[PDB]
Amino acid sequence: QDGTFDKLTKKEALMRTRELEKLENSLGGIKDMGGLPDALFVIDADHEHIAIKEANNLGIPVFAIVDTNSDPDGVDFVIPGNDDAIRAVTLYLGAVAATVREGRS
Amino acid sequence: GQKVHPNGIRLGIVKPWNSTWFANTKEFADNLDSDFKVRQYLTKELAKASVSRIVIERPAKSIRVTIHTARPGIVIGKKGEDVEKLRKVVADIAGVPAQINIAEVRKPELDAKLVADSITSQLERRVMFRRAMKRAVQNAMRLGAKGIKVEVSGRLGGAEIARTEWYREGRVPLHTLRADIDYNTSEAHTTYGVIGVKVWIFKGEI
Amino acid sequence: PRRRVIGQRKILPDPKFGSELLAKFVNILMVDGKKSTAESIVYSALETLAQRSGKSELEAFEVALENVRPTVEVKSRRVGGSTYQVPVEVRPVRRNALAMRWIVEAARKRGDKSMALRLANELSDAAENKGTAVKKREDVHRMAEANKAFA
């Protein structure tokens, strides 16, 4: 952003821009984590099977929202609801955000 | 035996020449023979003193030998006796008064010839080839280097068949020409035969 | 080739009156890379044919060529089993070149006095369709029209 971005080559500058965009939209949210997470709020258990399969391999609660076609086996606290409709997910997720943020009291 | 010499391929790009002198086609061969003779004699004499390379220049019909080593104290002796001893026993054959000059390096674990000498000296003490190779590579990498690759070949372990074993650590690009790569081979004559040990030390990329 | 879909090269036009077809004809006359001599022979035969038939250098060639210009050629395209011939229409860029090649091949033989005289006689003969290049054309047309069952 401030140092070396127009030094070597314009093609390589575009290369680095593409690399940064890819790395950020892939692993940009968990950037400032710094350690291991404590809870994994997941939106699906049938589609994102491997996420829970990995989170259950160690002592991390993986309570999540599951629909009818998923396996409520490895999840800690199953939440029955919809996973695709935006309205449904946003209601659940707004409740989640309010409960976590007032928990910062 | 299918690769090119990493030093010969970079003699003009990065790595310089060992002998830097100009002579015309009449005495070129005589000069090269004198250089070879002084080099082999100096090595046979200072084998126990760690010399990696010997630069042989000749300013104005006066030979100058810059000995790059790691232990200059054993080379010069107290009061410097051995240096003038070498000067005499070198000028006896060079034909002119020789000006020899020692130069030490405080990182002997990064020189190809020095590492090969260590491996050969450790092998000639019945040391395990695996232990020696691993210890040398670990020492080099903890002393500082962007990449190393050692290769031993022969009757290691006293076997009847010969197997070549190489161990690498880091980045060692031999096809990149701008890279600074030290390479040199050492022979080791044991009670069972000859063992060759070559080393690629990727000191830096430029 | 297999992947390269490159096309043909752009040859140099003729140093005489502008013409690419007789330039290609000259290019296919040359042995040992001697182009000056080939151009001299081509010009000699062209003048000898124009003065003898009444037409000019560019028109005379055209009449002769079309008499040796083949229609279809047979080539082996085996399809899962038997190996048979397949008569097919040849592209024009290869058709004219092959006509000129047959002309030069017929002229290589039949040595009258010189190469220029050979080629002028061969062109005159193809003009009335009784030479050897036309005989080769008819041999190709006979190889075709007989094995036309494979299509």
Binding site: - | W21, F22, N24, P59, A60 | -
Partner: protein, 98 residues
């Protein structure tokens, strides 16, 4: 007058050798002509990389010899001896002719 012809192997050494030998003679012995190119002599060699059969495998080496003329015009006192006993920056065969 003074024909100075210097030849060496490495150009990125001979060039600065010429620069120093020219400024150490023009700052006090000016009216010099500079580093004339004097094209390079390329001695090539083609050897066999194997000690035995497989002749088709050969190595190709060459040595370049770069030459330069300085061509000083006037035999000055700031020049004749200031050229002598100053033979550092070795690796370059220098020849002075009167």
């Amino acid at each position: 007058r003074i024909r100075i012809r210097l030849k060496a192997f490495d150009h990125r050494l001979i060039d600065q050798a010429t620069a120093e030998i020219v400024e150490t003679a023009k700052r006090t012995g000016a009216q010099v002509r500079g580093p004339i190119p004097l094209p390079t002599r390329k001695e090539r060699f083609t050897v066999l990389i194997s000690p035995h059969v497989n002749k088709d495998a050969r190595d190709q080496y060459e040595i370049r010899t770069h030459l330069r003329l300085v061509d000083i015009v006037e035999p000055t006192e700031k020049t004749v001896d200031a050229l002598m006993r100053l033979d550092l920056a070795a690796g370059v065969d220098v020849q002075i002719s009167l």
